[PDB]
Design a protein around this ligand. Structure first.
Ligand SMILES: [Ca+2]
Ligand SMILES: [Ca+2]
Ligand SMILES: [Ca+2]
Ligand SMILES: [Ca+2]
Lengths: 134, 136
């Protein structure tokens, strides 16, 4: 907890044993992830309903750390764990209009909230997560 | 350690920054009813005490009521804990009693060219941020 002060000074904040960072620029999924990795973190991994509610309450469209396995329409978190519990928004994931949508955003729009597969080269604000406590 | 203090608030969606727990509402409300919610939860509207805390507030990219209110019509300001305003982060041209109307309550405004505090009519609605200072 004394260890958290330099993170707070950089604008990270603490929820349920992880530190989180919300970007102030948008970027592609891969470059977003590169920022998080450079900070010793990764894109956010949603492990519980409470964490999804925390994510949603920022009212912000955000890249998160979930990516398709090639074109198989199966999904894996950035730490290598397989997708189990999911929070896809209505009608997602869908490879919209036949385009390859391999990366996952939390979408925040009126009538439409939750995860969406999106073209990875599109840009979004992004959320990093770093596990601190065991 | 500190988790016995924190986990019941994490369980309600609060989150921890510096010595405080913070709550972002999921409904909009008037400044006074926003405050009433924070008070009911054992907290108050957010009080900005440092540049780092202002940067934290601003990075949520969200217009939010905060715990700063005018003293009557005197154009002086006091935080909800009774402390006088010292360091400030007003957006450009604020506070201004816009168009002659009484703007006694303070929001953090998030718009494309303009960020920072704004005085606004208290009866208008915004999302709000509560703060509960939990650690000494
Ligand atoms: Ca997580
Ligand atoms: Ca999609
Ligand atoms: Ca404060
Ligand atoms: Ca104003």
């Amino acid at each position: 907890f004394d260890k958290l002060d330099p993170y707070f000074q950089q604008g990270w904040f603490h929820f349920q044993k992880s530190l989180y960072y919300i970007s102030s620029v948008k970027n592609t999924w891969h470059l977003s992830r590169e920022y998080c990795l450079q900070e010793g973190a990764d894109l956010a991994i949603i492990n519980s309903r409470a964490e999804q509610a925390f994510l949603e309450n920022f009212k912000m469209t955000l890249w998160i750390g979930l990516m398709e396995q090639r074109s198989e329409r199966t999904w894996r978190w950035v730490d290598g764990t397989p997708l189990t519990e999911s929070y896809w928004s209505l009608g997602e994931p869908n490879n919209y209009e036949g385009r390859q949508e391999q990366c996952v955003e939390q979408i925040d729009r009126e009538d439409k909230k939750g995860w969406n597969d999106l073209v990875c080269e599109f840009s979004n604000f992004y959320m990093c997560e770093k596990r601190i406590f065991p």
